[PDB]
Amino acid sequence: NSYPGCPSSYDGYCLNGGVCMHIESLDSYTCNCVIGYSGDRCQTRDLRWWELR
Template structure:
C-alpha cells in the first residue's frame, strides 16, 4: 500500500476560510483544510483570540 506522507499542501479552495490573518492549506490526500493561525489566535479557523499565548508560536488546527 502507498503512504499518504508526506502530504502535499494545495491552495485552499475556499476564500477567507481561515480568519484573523490565518493561512489556509488543503491536503487533498486526506480531504482536510488546515489553518495556520497568525500569532495571538487559535481555533480550527483561527476564530479565537489566544489570550494565554500571545507571544507563542502559531498554532495549526486540522479538521
C-alpha cells in the same frame, strides 16, 4: 505537491492571519493561526501578534 492554499470554494473560512492549508490525496483541508490569532478557527485577533508594533 501538497498544493498550497485551498479550494477557492473556501476563500473565507480562515480567520485573522489564518493560513489555509491543504493536504493532498485526502483532498482534505485545514487552517493555522499564529502568535495573536486563536480561538475557534482563529477569530481571536488580540493584543498579541501585531501588538501595534
